[PDB]
């Protein structure tokens, strides 16, 4: 070996770094913040000092342990490797501050630590630590130890300080306690043992099987620590009683106490993620199994991805399966984390750690307990057993860039209440126990569902009849070829309703309707309602089968049709009321209002939808649910907005219930059209003050400048609403309100509403519930999810349907008992949609639960156009990546700028790798979109096989460096770092070999400018 013997005489030993050591420097120097894995421990001490014996005692310890004389040589050699220097002098800093009061003394000490912790170490120059003294009285003094975590774990520090203080007193004649020689020790024996382990096929295949089809999870983020600096420690109270009960539980189950505390961690993660399949890092203390193999100092840690599914059960079952998953991976535990995953595919967001441990002249620390230390984990649960009380306690160490105090306050409560339940009610089902704070329960369940409003009872047509009395000569409908006054419309609805009544239609009688969109259509609706029946909507502009499958399901009493559509019908064996055939017999009927004793609980209509697989399902909507919607709409929309409401939606769909009956309830008029795309070619387009449609259709009308300047409100509902679009609509200055509304057919037409602000930033929400409607975000066990967590959207209140027609079993499945109401009838409708709450109570709609897709990093959903459409193009790999479909407006967009812009705003696993610059996106009419008809892209390479543009704007030195460390021939200037096989651990030796080459770069600059092109510019010289 010409390296063993080509070492400085300074160095006596040399051996490579572990993947963790390189992982730690990677995190320490990821940016210039430089606070992670630089630990600073201080100690306030009543004693008699010995600044010479204290110093010499350090010299005894540093020569005692090679890791305490270790330098780092990163780039210069083949692999980064640790250089063990033969001996080093190490000073002890001193400050005298007796002249200051005790309160002033800690201000100046914390000031010293705050300065020291970001004061980086020079790896190549030993030692990787510093000591320091602050003098207060001749007996009060602070001793501070500042070190880098790549050299020492918390265990190493513990026994490092121990050997110290019994060689400090050794040189003091207080008690002579001789120190024993070092054992068969080597941090290399571990470094050598960890190398053997990376190439062992039994470790690789084991974790390959254990992690096969995991569901990775990121914690929810809706806050940051922009207030607290480095008090990123959250203290979770644990009382004496609860510590004892936690110990009792581990005895009863028969596992070590650590497995009880680990099960609490798993409980809160499942709660926070609404995920039963949970992965979290277990901090393992990989010491050499020989005796006196835990007295050697160094870094012996590996963090393993423990996987576990929370099916449910008593707490004791969760404990036992936390024990089962720990021994399961006991022997295979030294396989390093970096070899498990890849850079940018972190296996877990969080981690668990448990710290077991255990006179008057000096010895005792008076205020010696301040430990500053940070990891790279967003949430580390730092359990320990206090050495003197033997009581359990917990500190949540969190990443303020990812979790704020408004969030950590709730996380800490979840941990506190989880440990309460385990210690006191440790025999309940853990998946039903309420871990949410009393404050959070009230806000999620009460305050954000406080929508009760007392409206007049009654029916849909009663709202119309009353408006006829109040303005009988006002216009009710304007079609292309006629109008009708409120009296004129009413009198015909009475006449048709009487003819139907004397044909034999009464309460709960279903009469369908297949009519071309003319005023007889609305007359048909109103006459059916005025008699006391309920209409089943049919639209002649739809294929004949769709009509048949509904009539089949509904089995209607009789059908109102025109002579021109009976033909379209498959000879419905029931009674027909071919309208024009016997208009003569209509006209004999009275014009007076039928005043039948209709109940608001009678069915008003049966709206037919399709399930996920495509079966018919008729939604039975009562009058009171519709009147509640209309009465609420009276409050929200003005008379000037309701002056002319466009009737564009097919009555087969529930948005027609809003467009038709609402203007008739207030005095406005239906501006009737065949669809929203006929609006520009319509006579009364000038009269339209409100349109009620779907985002794509209003985009259609926007390109061609087809929105009448008299339109003052736009109601949007039915697909994803881009804030880019509401901002165009508001730019037409007459448009005064733009609403995003949500609601399944099972909850009448609308369930939630949001008056999307002008200039509003970010995703538009679907808002919060309308009058007499309640919303809940639950898990599979119908438990409310924490604020910000994704869950199933449930809806209750006055808008819920009776049932699915002729399908009572599906009705029970979808309309479940309401756990949050005492009322007898109280149901909740399972929407099948996912959602979460924004902090202000607004609801963030996340789509149906079925098509929410998957990938490593974190398996969740797409719908992230907020940055266009995203797709999943399954290729014959069955190994996949995210695809974009962009358009833009004028000049091209730097597609990479569109990724780094999202790098600091959106998570990396969600950020796609493939872009497509398009123009024409698919749509087969104005509603049905075709995801499967999106252009399958081509791999950017080929055509340019050995595509190698020369590299002349100082890529020169950068390309050199990539080439030497990555073993590839030469690089192209537009190549990406991670695609040519670079990772986090390699990013360091890229920064380092760029250092002596005259360039300063950060690992953060590598991960946001991974191309050799944009990385070369942000590179610096610094004279």
Ligand X SMILES: *P(=O)(O)OCC(C)(C)[C@@H](O)C(=O)NCCC(=O)NCCS
Ligand Y SMILES: Nc1ncnc2c1ncn2[C@@H]1O[C@H](COP(=O)(O)OP(=O)(O)OP(=O)(O)O)[C@@H](O)[C@H]1O
Instruction: Name the binder of 301 from ligand Y, ligand X, none, CB < 5-8 A by kind.
Output: ligand X
818 is an annotated ligand-binding site residue? no
Number of residues that bind ligand X (CB under 6 A): 17
Nearest by Cα to 851 from 870, 876, 867, 865: 870
- Cβ closest to ligand X, residue 423 vs residue 985: 985
> Which residues are near ligand Y by CB under 6 A?
717-721, 740-742, 763-764, 766, 833, 845, 847-848, 863
Burial of residue 161 (number of CB atoms within 10 Å: 0-12, 13-18, 19+): middle
Q: Strand 882-885 relative to strand 869-872: parallel, antiparallel, unpaired?
A: antiparallel
* Alpha-carbon distances of 544 from 77, 517, 649, rounded to whole Å: 77, 17, 19
Instruction: Name the binder of 649 from ligand Y, ligand X, none, CB < 5-8 A by kind.
Output: none
797 strand-pairing partners: 773
Sign of the alpha-carbon dihedral angle for 1016, 1019, 1020, 1021: negative
984 is an annotated ligand-binding site residue? yes
Instruction: Name the binder of 740 from ligand X, ligand Y, none, CB < 5-8 A by kind.
Output: ligand Y
341 is an annotated ligand-binding site residue? no
Site for ligand X in 345-384 (CB under 6 A): 375-376
147 binds ligand X (CB under 6 A): no
Torsion of CA 295, 299, 305, 308, to 10 degrees: 30
Q: List, as own/partner pairs, every contact residues 584-592 make where C-beta atoms lie below 8 angstroms and the sequence separation is at least 24, other chains included.
A: 585/499, 586/495, 586/496, 586/499, 587/495, 589/494, 589/495, 589/496, 589/498, 589/499, 590/494, 590/495, 590/498, 591/490, 591/491, 591/494, 591/495, 592/494
Instruction: Name the binder of 845 from ligand Y, ligand X, none, CB < 5-8 A by kind.
Output: ligand Y
Burial of residue 759 (number of CB atoms within 10 Å: 0-12, 13-18, 19+): exposed
Number of neighbours of residue 861 by Cβ within 10 angstroms:
17
223 is an annotated ligand-binding site residue? no
301 binds ligand X (CB under 6 A): yes
CA gap 639, 663 in Å, rounded:
9
Burial state string for 321-336 with b = 16 or more CB within 10 A and e = fewer than 16: bbbebbeebeebbbbb
128 binds ligand X (CB under 6 A): no
- Cβ closest to ligand Y, residue 50 vs residue 727: 727
CB 1019, CB 1006: distance < 8 Å: no
Nearest by Cα to 332 from 224, 197, 452: 197
740 is an annotated ligand-binding site residue? yes
Give the contact letters, 191-230, x = binds to ligand X (CB under 6 A), - = no: ----------------------------------------
68 binds ligand X (CB under 6 A): no
Instruction: Name the binder of 337 from ligand Y, ligand X, none, CB < 5-8 A by kind.
Output: ligand X
Burial of residue 957 (number of CB atoms within 10 Å: 0-12, 13-18, 19+): middle
Instruction: Name the binder of 375 from ligand X, ligand Y, none, CB < 5-8 A by kind.
Output: ligand X
344 is an annotated ligand-binding site residue? yes
Angle at 71 between CA 65 and CA 75, to 5 degrees: 145
Q: Find the shortest distance in angstroms from Cβ 764 to ligand Y.
A: 6
Instruction: Name the binder of 721 from ligand Y, ligand X, none, CB < 5-8 A by kind.
Output: ligand Y
Instruction: Name the binder of 23 from ligand X, ligand Y, none, CB < 5-8 A by kind.
Output: ligand X
Q: Choose the stretch contacting ligand X; rule: CB under 6 A; options: 18-26, 228-236, 536-544, 666-674.
A: 18-26
Q: Find the shortest distance in angstroms from Cβ 260 to ligand Y.
A: 41
- Cβ closest to ligand Y, residue 313 vs residue 847: 847
- Cβ closest to ligand X, residue 488 vs residue 984: 984
* Alpha-carbon distances of 475 from 492, 585, 592, 634, 674, rounded to whole Å: 14, 26, 19, 18, 19
Instruction: Name the binder of 548 from ligand Y, ligand X, none, CB < 5-8 A by kind.
Output: none
Tell me phi and psi for residue 455, to 5 degrees: -100, 160
- Cβ closest to ligand Y, residue 469 vs residue 933: 933
1008 binds ligand X (CB under 6 A): no
The DSSP result for 386-451, as a single string, is: -TTT--EEEEEEE-TTT--HHHHHHHHHHHHHHHHHHHHSTTSBTTTS--S-HHHHHHHHTGGG--
* Of positions 14, 17, 23, 412, contacts ligand X by CB under 6 A: 23
Q: Choose the stretch contacting ligand X; rule: CB under 6 A; options: 336-344, 673-681, 819-827, 945-953.
A: 336-344
Instruction: Name the binder of 983 from ligand Y, ligand X, none, CB < 5-8 A by kind.
Output: ligand X
- Cβ closest to ligand Y, residue 141 vs residue 653: 653
* Alpha-carbon distances of 298 from 57, 60, 365, 516, 554, rounded to whole Å: 19, 17, 25, 83, 76
Q: Find the shortest distance in angstroms from Cβ 845 to ligand Y.
A: 4
Instruction: Name the binder of 763 from ligand X, ligand Y, none, CB < 5-8 A by kind.
Output: ligand Y
Q: Find the shortest distance in angstroms from Cβ 47 to ligand X.
A: 31
- Cβ closest to ligand Y, residue 188 vs residue 836: 836
Q: Which 8-state DSSP code applies to residue 66? A: G
21 binds ligand X (CB under 6 A): no
Point out the annotated binding site for (R)-4'-phosphopantetheine.
344, 984
Point out the annotated binding site for ATP.
740-741, 763, 848
Point out the annotated binding site.
344, 740-741, 763, 848, 984
Q: What is the binding site for ligand X (CB under 6 A)?
A: 19-20, 23, 26-27, 283, 301, 303, 337-338, 343-344, 375-376, 983-985
């Amino acid at each position: 070996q010409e390296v063993r013997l080509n070492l400085p005489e300074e160095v006596e030993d040399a051996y490579p770094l572990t993947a963790l050591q390189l992982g730690m420097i990677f995190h320490s120097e990821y940016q210039g913040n430089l606070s992670v894995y630089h630990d600073v421990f201080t100690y306030h001490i009543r004693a008699d000092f010995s600044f010479p014996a204290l110093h010499s005692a350090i010299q005894e310890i540093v020569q005692r342990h090679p890791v305490l004389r270790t330098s780092f040589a990163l780039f210069e050699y083949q692999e980064p490797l640790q250089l063990v220097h033969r001996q080093i002098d190490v000073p002890l800093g001193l400050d005298d501050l007796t002249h200051l009061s005790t309160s002033e003394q800690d201000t100046a000490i914390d000031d010293w630590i705050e300065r020291e912790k970001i004061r980086t170490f020079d790896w190549n120059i030993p030692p990787l630590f510093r000591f320091h003294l602050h003098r207060r009285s001749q007996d009060n003094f602070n001793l501070t130890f500042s070190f880098h975590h790549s050299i020492l774990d918390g265990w190493s520090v513990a026994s490092l300080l121990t050997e110290l203080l019994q060689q400090y007193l050794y040189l003091l004649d207080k008690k002579v306690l001789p120190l024993s020689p070092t054992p068969a020790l080597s941090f290399r024996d571990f470094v050598a043992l960890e190398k053997k382990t990376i190439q062992s096929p039994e470790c690789q295949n084991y974790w390959q099987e254990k992690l096969r089809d995991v569901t990775l999870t990121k914690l929810p983020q809706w806050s940051k620590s922009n207030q607290v600096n480095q008090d990123w420690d959250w203290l979770v109270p644990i009382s004496s009683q609860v510590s004892q009960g936690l110990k009792q539980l581990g005895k009863q189950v028969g596992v070590p106490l650590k497995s009880v505390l680990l099960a609490a961690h798993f409980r809160v993660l499942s709660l926070l993620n609404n995920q039963r399949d949970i992965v979290t890092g277990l901090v393992s203390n990989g010491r050499l199994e020989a005796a006196d193999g835990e007295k050697i100092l160094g870094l012996f840690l590996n963090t393993l991805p423990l996987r576990l599914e929370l099916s449910g059960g008593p707490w004791s079952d969760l404990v036992k399966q936390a024990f089962d998953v720990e021994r399961e991976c006991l022997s295979w535990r030294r396989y390093p984390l970096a070899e498990l995953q890849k850079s940018g595919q972190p296996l877990f967001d969080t981690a668990f750690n448990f710290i077991h441990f255990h006179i008057g002249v000096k010895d005792l620390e008076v205020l010696g307990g301040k430990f500053f230390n940070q990891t790279n984990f967003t949430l580390l649960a730092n359990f320990s057993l206090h050495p003197l009380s033997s009581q359990i306690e917990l500190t949540l160490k969190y990443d303020g860039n990812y979790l704020g105090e408004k969030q950590m306050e709730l996380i800490g409560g979840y941990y506190e209440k989880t440990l309460i339940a385990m210690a006191t009610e440790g025999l309940e089902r853990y998946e039903t126990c309420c871990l949410l704070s009393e404050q959070e329960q009230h806000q999620l369940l009460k305050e954000w569902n406080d929508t009760e409003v007392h409206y007049p009872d009654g029916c849909i047509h009663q709202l119309f009849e009353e408006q006829v009395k109040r303005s009988p000569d006002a216009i009710a409908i304007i079609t292309e070829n006629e109008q009708l006054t409120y009296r004129q419309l009413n009198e015909k609805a009475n006449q048709l309703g009487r003819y139907l009544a004397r044909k034999g239609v009464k309460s709960e009688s279903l009469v369908g309707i297949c009519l071309e969109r003319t005023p007889e259509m609305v007359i048909g609706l109103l006459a059916i309602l005025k008699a006391g029946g309920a209409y089943v909507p049919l639209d002649p502009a739809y294929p004949t089968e769709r009509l048949n499958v509904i009539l089949e399901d509904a089995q209607v009493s009789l059908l109102l049709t025109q002579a021109k559509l009976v033909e379209k019908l498959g000879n419905y064996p029931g009674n027909l009321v071919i309208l024009e055939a016997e208009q003569k017999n209509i006209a004999l009927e009275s014009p007076e209002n039928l005043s039948l004793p209709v109940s608001s609980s009678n069915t008003a209509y049966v709206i037919y939808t399709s399930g996920s697989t495509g079966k018919p399902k008729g939604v039975v909507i009562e009058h009171h649910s519709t009147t509640t919607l209309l009465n609420w709409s009276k409050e929200v929309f003005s008379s000037e907005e309701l002056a002319g409401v466009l009737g564009s939606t097919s009555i087969c769909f529930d948005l027609s219930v809003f467009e038709l009956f609402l203007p008739l309830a207030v005095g406005g008029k239906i501006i009737l059209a065949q669809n929203v795309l006929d609006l520009p070619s319509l006579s009364a387009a000038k009269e339209v003050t409100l349109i009620n449609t779907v985002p794509t259709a209003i985009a259609q009308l926007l390109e061609i400048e087809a929105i009448p300047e008299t339109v003052r409100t736009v109601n949007l509902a039915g697909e994803a609403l881009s804030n880019q679009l509401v901002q165009k609509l508001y730019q037409q200055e007459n448009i005064k309100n733009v609403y995003n509304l949500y609601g399944p057919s099972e909850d009448t037409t609308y369930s939630t509403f949001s008056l999307v602000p002008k200039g509003h930033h970010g995703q538009p929400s679907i808002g919060r519930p309308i009058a007499n409607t309640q919303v809940y975000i639950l898990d599979s066990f119908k438990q409310p999810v924490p604020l910000g967590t994704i869950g199933d959207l449930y809806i209750g209140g006055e808008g819920l349907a009776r049932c699915y027609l002729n399908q009572p079993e599906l009705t029970a499945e979808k309309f479940i008992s309401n756990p949050f109401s005492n009322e007898p009838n109280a149901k909740l409708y399972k929407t099948g949609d996912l959602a979460r709450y924004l902090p202000d109570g607004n609801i963030d709609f996340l789509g149906r639960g079925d098509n929410q897709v998957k990938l490593r990093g974190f398996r969740i959903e797409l719908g992230e156009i907020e940055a266009a459409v995203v797709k999943v193009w399954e290729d014959s790999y069955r190994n996949k990546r995210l695809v974009a479909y962009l358009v833009a407006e004028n000049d091209p967009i730097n597609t990479e700028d569109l990724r780094r812009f999202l790098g600091q705003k959106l998570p990396e696993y969600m950020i796609p790798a493939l872009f497509v610059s398009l123009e024409a996106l698919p749509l087969t009419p104005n509603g049905k979109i075709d995801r499967s008809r999106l252009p399958i892209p081509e791999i950017p390479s080929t055509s340019e096989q050995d595509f190698v543009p020369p590299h002349t704007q100082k890529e020169k030195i950068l390309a050199s460096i990539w080439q030497d460390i990555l073993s590839i021939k030469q690089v192209s200037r537009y190549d990406r770092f991670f695609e040519v096989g670079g990772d986090s651990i390699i990013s360091i030796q890229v920064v380092a070999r760029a250092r002596q080459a005259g360039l300063k770069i950060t690992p953060k600059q590598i991960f946001e400018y991974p191309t050799l092109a944009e990385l070369a510019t942000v590179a610096d010289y610094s004279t």
